[PDB]
Amino acid sequence: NSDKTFLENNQYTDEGVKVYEFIFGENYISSGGLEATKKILSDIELNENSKVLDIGSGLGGGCMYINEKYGAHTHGIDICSNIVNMANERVSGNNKIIFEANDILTKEFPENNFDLIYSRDAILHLSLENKNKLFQKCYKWLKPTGTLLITDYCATEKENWDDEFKEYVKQRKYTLITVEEYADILTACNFKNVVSKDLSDYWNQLLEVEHKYLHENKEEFLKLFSEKKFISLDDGWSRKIKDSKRKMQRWGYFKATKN
Numbered sequence: 001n002s003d004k005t006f007l008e009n010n011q012y013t014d015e016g017v018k019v020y021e022f023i024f025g026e027n028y029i030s031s032g033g034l035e036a037t038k039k040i041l042s043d044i045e046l047n048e049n050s051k052v053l054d055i056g057s058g059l060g061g062g063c064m065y066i067n068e069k070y071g072a073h074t075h076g077i078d079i080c081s082n083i084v085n086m087a088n089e090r091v092s093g094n095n096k097i098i099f100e101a102n103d104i105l106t107k108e109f110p111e112n113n114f115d116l117i118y119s120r121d122a123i124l125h126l127s128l129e130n131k132n133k134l135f136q137k138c139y140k141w142l143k144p145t146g147t148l149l150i151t152d153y154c155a156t157e158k159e160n161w162d163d164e165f166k167e168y169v170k171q172r173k174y175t176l177i178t179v180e181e182y183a184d185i186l187t188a189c190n191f192k193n194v195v196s197k198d199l200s201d202y203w204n205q206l207l208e209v210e211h212k213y214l215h216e217n218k219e220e221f222l223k224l225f226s227e228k229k230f231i232s233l234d235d236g237w238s239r240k241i242k243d244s245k246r247k248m249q250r251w252g253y254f255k256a257t258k259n
């Protein structure tokens with residue numbers, strides 16, 4: 001009843017994680033790395049007394065940035081123990097950053113605890129039933145004055161997927177839904193002021209920067225990895241660029257409040 005072994009042994013092996021970090025940037029394994037993070041948080045207000053939860057915290061770049069910018073207490077949860085071990089090696093002497101290995105679906109936190117619950121491209125791993133269960137937990141865990149802030153991989157309606165896109169989703173065991181279905185889940189969970197944005201155009205821009213970087217730094221990549229891994233990454237980004245342009249694969253942004 002867990003995907004922990006599946007994730008640790010395939011997509012998020014140590015080397016898999018290091019390949020992602022090469023292309024996304026130091027401390028990041030998701031879209032746009034540091035630059036997208038600055039943008040996503042540009043209108044967010046927190047301070048040194050704030051409490052933040054990062055769901056699917058990865059190598060911890062997001063927690064590092066939120067703590068640096070605001071001085072906030074940050075608690076990241078990630079199901080992959082090897083990734084959490086790597087995250088903890090990236091931070092020292094800071095008792096306001098915590099990284100914990102756990103399945104968010106089984107983790108308990110106090111009701112009315114967090115000023116911000118933040119997640120970047122992680123919830124795509126959860127089944128539709130579990131997305132709904134997670135957002136019910138998030139609603140409970142947010143302070144009355146708290147905010148939910150998410151980016152996640154979305155898609156056009158499943159009926160519209162082509163062969164290559166179906167294979168991509170199946171191989172990774174992603175559950176991708178439309179930006180609109182996702183927003184409706186938040187509304188159903190009683191979140192208020194639900195804002196969704198289809199950021200597929202911006203995502204396409206981020207992908208192009210990354211793809212260019214990969215090509216310009218191929219020699220360095222090959223010193224670290226193998227040509228086989230290069231080709232896989234290169235082809236993967238090419239498909240994401242193509243599919244984001246036509247909105248077959250989409251990038252969703254969601255912000256909501258508890259009250």
Ligand SMILES: C[S@@+](CC[C@H](N)C(=O)[O-])C[C@H]1O[C@@H](n2cnc3c(N)ncnc32)[C@H](O)[C@@H]1O
Nearest residue numbers: 028029030056058078079080103104121122125
């Ligand atoms: C995009 S990657 C990490 C993203 C990270 N926020 C970043 O921007 O670099 C997705 C992460 O979600 C985590 N994840 C998947 N299912 C999870 C679950 N059920 N509970 C906690 N973390 C999970 C994976 O371990 C993985 O590190």
